[PDB]
């Protein structure tokens, strides 16, 4: 099977930092496109980073500066660093393979609270 395995996420002040960690396992990381997708309570799915298999990555305007996306082939590991946090970015964080196609895999989720 699949495992993608989110942690990094905690409460913290706007204005503040995390780096979320997803440890993937059981499909070929390296050819595989990677997403970070967030559910905001009371919303359904949105997708917040995507990074492909050269390293080019994409993200939704709201986050464009604050947010970086970043993969560790060696380590099997894909990063989200989150800068300068809102209470807006509260939301249940989400690793994904491939969430595009094909074969499309979603791990467990990592919490984020931002408030003062």
């Known amino acids: 099977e699949v495992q993608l395995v989110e942690s990094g996420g905690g409460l913290v002040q706007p204005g503040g930092s995390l780096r979320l960690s997803c440890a993937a396992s059981?499909?070929?990381?390296?050819?595989?496109?990677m997403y970070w997708l967030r559910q905001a309570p009371g919303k359904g799915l949105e997708w917040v980073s995507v990074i492909n298999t050269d390293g080019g990555t994409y993200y939704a305007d709201s986050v464009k500066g604050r947010f970086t996306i970043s993969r560790d082939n060696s380590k099997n590991t894909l990063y989200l660093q989150m800068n300068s946090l809102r209470a807006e970015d509260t939301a249940v964080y989400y690793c994904?393979?491939?969430?595009?196609?094909?074969?499309?895999?979603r791990g467990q989720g990592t919490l984020v609270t931002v408030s003062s």
């Open positions: 059981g499909f070929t990381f390296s050819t595989s496109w």
């Open positions: 994904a393979k491939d969430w595009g196609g094909p074969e499309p895999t």
